[model samples]
Target chain A: DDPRLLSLFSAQREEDADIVIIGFPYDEGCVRNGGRAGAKKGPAAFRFFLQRLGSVNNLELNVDASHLKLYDAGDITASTLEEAHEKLESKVFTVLARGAFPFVIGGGNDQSAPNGRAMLRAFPGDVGVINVDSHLDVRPPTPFRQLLEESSFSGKRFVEFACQGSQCGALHAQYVRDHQGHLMWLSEVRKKGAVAALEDAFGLTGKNTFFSFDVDSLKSSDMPGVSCPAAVGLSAQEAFDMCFLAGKTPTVMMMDMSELNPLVEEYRSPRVAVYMFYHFVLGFATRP
Target chain B: DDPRLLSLFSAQREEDADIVIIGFPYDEGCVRNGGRAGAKKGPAAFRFFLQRLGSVNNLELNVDASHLKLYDAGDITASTLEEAHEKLESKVFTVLARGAFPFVIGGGNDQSAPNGRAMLRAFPGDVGVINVDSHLDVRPPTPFRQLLEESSFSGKRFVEFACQGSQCGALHAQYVRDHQGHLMWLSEVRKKGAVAALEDAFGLTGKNTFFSFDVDSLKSSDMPGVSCPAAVGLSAQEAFDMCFLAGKTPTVMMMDMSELNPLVEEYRSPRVAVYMFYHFVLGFATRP
Candidate 1:
């Protein structure tokens, strides 16, 4: 029997993988952050599309399955957001320690702390964390505040780009600005052009960067399955382009897409997240 | 009570409408023609999204609800495809006679014959028919062949564009060619640019054009919920642009989007069809 195309990259062992996928199914932080709680189902919904989205156009893209090795770590089980983040950080650390790229999929923005911690632990002094999101993610303290203080991370090295002016608060903006973390609002990104803004954002990062994507950063029309959907954000095409650029940067060590709520519509954000993952992997394949 | 934005264009009478929507819930022709059967549910699924796709970004587009008058004549009731077509023909004919543009949502390609017949009857000598589809639809004698023969239609004026070479038969090609009907393959459309190819395709028409769209003409990735999906076809953006262009053309009298299968995925083609309808309305609003 002929096997399907996407399954070809299903590596048997983690050590044999070139890229590893880790799903964080935690959503307590989202609820605590005053957002929706259905994102716990986001990871499963994402895998639903990934499996059904066969390699129909692989030949056109010259995407060689043989060259791309992918392994799914499955969804993490944790009683609390802290436990979830801890387990995720360990999984990402192991995959990165084994010389494989970790493609982290949702739970909530809370998962970013542990992911960024792993990148900081692995790459040390020259690591950068860039969050492509709508909110500043600085509210509840443990997330970015801990990463900023505990890691001795320079505010200049941390970039919060593609943010919504309405969703973010003055206090949070002041906190990031006072701490010297770079903040690029969505309107600025749109005015300066996505490419130029992204180029400038990446310029603030170190050679090694941890890329965190929040689906809420995309316009509700483009990505409606987020906990906090933006009325006007990045276009789907623009988001895909940005994801590819993130993947193409060889020094971009870690990546994660957060806050996908399958409860809204099973197909909308799940399919979008997978397609974004594909673009990232495709870009990774072309990396020098 | 403040009503929704899309509802602002909803008209109570056909005579007062600039654009009228008629849904054909019949799909026995699809099953009879050896295809899938769930397309009968397409109309309800299409309306589901149309009701929710609000005009959040209408101001950015300068889309004035005051200029666009929409009327929905509910779904037709028919036990047989023939009865279905006859009911559809009368509905479309009434809308056309009342000087309102008809937006027919699918039952099947079988409905195309009736829509085109109504167009032919209304515009008489100076009418044109264009089926933007993957199939030639000349297979069943009652459909295009009857329209071709009974209307004394010139094959030169009947254009089938965005067709996939794989789905169409050589015999069907011969039939259309013998009749002098224009056929533009999907490959040709891709190579010549969608706009240029569409302009060329529209050129093979009279001042008044009947435009029929088959969702299957789009690639499966873009439009998966169709009776027959094309693996390699037009992109969603291209389809939207084409739909808008169709609406913008002043003489484009009757338009129908057929063969949407909601059984596959509720969001895929239904949302696309609604979005396409929005673009068409947007384009129609811009018509001189």
Candidate 2:
């Protein structure tokens, strides 16, 4: 087997594993200018920042290692868009089979398609998705244009708990209309509170959930590092709180954090990413 | 003579008349990028900010008449690059000949050319130029390339008293070599002290003086509104002191404060510009 293929296939034994951090640096879905394609560099940049964490002389994070299993699956090689998605679906399924919860760091919002597909494959039953984002990336596929193509990622989808927050523009209006009864606007959450919204999303029995967080959901003035900055969005604190809450529930399976662009950010954006990751680890490590 | 053409011509008038503030919104001398051309809008933006200054709660400025008689000469229009230089020279010369001190705000550092020409045309013999800026703006005119299109106003003709402060580039060194005996670098000023530098500049009598201040001469982090920010430049206090000293001189016929872009600025830039202009007026009014 190829090195990239073998990295994805190999199961982490208890001795070899602590916390498996899988990085998928695919940038085939970027529509804008100035950003490079094939986001292979993102993983390296993420690791570089993570290694420098010990340099924080002021604060120390005494993380537990008893059940912690850390393993680097290197990178998944996907030359084309189809290949990348297929490889991601297969790799995530294998990780789930090994009884290790996958920590998927993404290239863009489109990466969620593969992660979502893999979760549904592992469970093969009812699944709900709590998408915490600025915009609902659910654009349907066109004949010439693929679904995961740069422009068409936000459309109506048949996923449970599709909660989108702080969205603007006509595209979002169209997305909500198409999704109809399934979609939950964040403004509605403020009027009806989180408990009511959660009850509406998953119903009585807490269903299996795939939690996805897009950092662009934060306000631009506070988080200028995101790819698409809208005037109104959730603050980083609210976003973290939502993720923490969702992560605490036993029904939640794999966690996917997408669309965190390190290239365009200052120091604060990466720090936010690290904080989000910390909460995610805490959520998964204590999952009953 | 045509009124428009006559406006271009200079005529003698009595001393202690009104002050004419001219806006030369021409940036054709820019060789680097297409974006800098928008500097033509600088005057309108500055005026807008000035109008809004009263709305700021903590800003306390005296809007009295005794300080100085101020006249807004509108803006000098120039379609072509050559026309811009010609219009600027003639307009400035007229402002000075009318016995009114000219405060010429700019399009770019290139505006210094017409500013220098006006001083030379009015007084002619020998003129001292105190440029409180990061770059000397005195590069020799390269044939066909128009290298000195912005800087060299009077080529080897007018005797100059040039004091260049905190130049971070090789261009400033080239300027010193080109201007030789007439030039004084920031290093030389530090070696001899500011008082000594001032004495040397004014010691040569029968020389009219032109004061040109580039806001970029202040540190970029402090003054983020400038076009090209050089890291090594004068402190805010140092720049203010130099401007005050020059403004107090009897021979200081014209003062041009150039290169303030509101689009690129933070909170401090506009406030700094207002304060700097006010102090310059104060120094000019209270001079012996």
Candidate 3:
């Protein structure tokens, strides 16, 4: 019994769909960065669980799939990550140009680089980037670092959230502070909550924002099947509420869930990604 | 491997424990009230999953739970629900008399009557009652109605939360309002968030409070294994945060999770009750 929401995901027609889901199945960046290698299986697992979610999200907002339009672009496969990144950026750019929201599920956090590039290209100078992760992922060789170093992007439009002090280096934290970027440590995010923290970030960001959600930002108990799971992090509920608010905000152009390694817990952890996606769709339906 | 926190649940002296858990394995009230049967199986399912939760709650508050003392009083059994409820009340009263917090896991919403009666006995005039449920449970024959009629408790100390207009009657809502008790409709609870709604309720209550939590107050998707499940209600996170805040508040003397029918989902829904209990214990660890 597939919910109507899952039935709404057509493999065709960009113009008819209000939102386009793009799955990037490339995690070589995670392997090269000395992380676990099973994130390459994330997007497929996400699709498997997405098929079984409840059709109506009647919590904070009343949303039914009867009026919602969605299109599935399927999974992207490439011989190399560099080529894969290029294809992902072009795909996201096409989706954005078509006036449909891009919902991306990643094999690793590296997909964020292409996703951010696509947003900046489509929105030009008015784009903000927010990364929700336990670690900064801004080390010299990381994909997120490449996006941060771009000349056209402003540091004022950057926000690094749910970061653990032990997982993130002091130099990176200082660099974010030095550049006037928002750095919300894990403790601080927990104290003010994901909603208010994102609200603060949204208040300071540009007209259009890109939300990069690395599954590692959630606590190991809430989301253990990731490239790198943290012992302490944001709860699944925080991510649930956070993503719904993001989708409801018209300024949020694109969203992505990265580093989900379904091979670890198989059933439990992968289901959380599906819930996160469901809530985002619910929020998107409320958008003006 | 058993977590240290689970190991902390001793079956020993209440005088040595900071909190005592008492399970009431009786749901005759649910069946008598035209609801489904099976919530009698809730407490055992709660114990099964509770043994597997993570020990340290490092989100928001850094609680290792090393210093927390917990005592498991085991399940209450009797030939009839009336006898079971009286036994439950006595156990709760004894726990409260010893200065140990009473953590009750119920077989049905009917458990709230004895639980509330026990609170009134221990604290007398300084008792507040807050029931979080989709249905008011204050119907003419309901156990909660029996507690409301008691001369000892003031209506101004009552708060009914997460109520759906369709599920609750107009007279019940009006009675609560006319008596100066707070009625937080489901939509209002969703709008203000559960933490803030309880905060507002707490702001109007006495020194000692009893929190009556019905599983039906949660969305059916989130918690379907109950005597009566709702299609629209609070998220698990809201309940998780709400219970934690309740445990942290010294004024909230007793709490009960009612109508958890684990036989419905077996694995998934029963797990929510355990998580709610886990968060409550985490909050209890941080209490002043």
TM-score, chain A, candidate 2: 0.72
User: Which is better, 1 or 2, measured by lDDT?
Assistant: 1
**Model 1: which docking level applies?**
incorrect
Model 1, B1-288: lDDT tens per residue? 333436745576667788888898877444444457777788999888888774623576675545577877789888776787798898898888878898988867778888878887887777788888877777743367777775456778888888754345556766788888888887678889886888787888767888888887876667878876554577888888898788788878879988898886577788888888887787787888
Clashing pairs in 1: none
Candidate 1 CA-lDDT value = 0.77
**Best-matching candidate per DockQ:** 1
DockQ of each: 0.08, 0.02, 0.03
lDDT of each: 0.77, 0.54, 0.79
Off by over 4 Å in 1: A1-5, A54-67, A140-142, B1-38, B41-104, B108-197, B200-211, B214-255, B259-288
- Order by DockQ, highest first: 1, 3, 2
Please tell me which predicted candidate would have the highest lDDT against the true structure.
3
Ranking by lDDT: 3, 1, 2
Candidate 2: where is the Cα deviation over 4 Å? A1-19, A30-40, A54-66, A141-172, A180-206, B1-288
Model 3, C-alpha of A11: deviation from truth (Å): 18
TM-score of 1: 0.65
Task: Compute each candidate's TM-score over C-alphas.
Answer: 0.65, 0.44, 0.60
Q: Give the TM-score comparing model 2 with the true structure, all chains together.
A: 0.44
User: Residue-wise lDDT of candidate 3 within A49-117, one digit each (tens)?
Assistant: 877775654644667655787888888778887898899999999999878888889888889998989
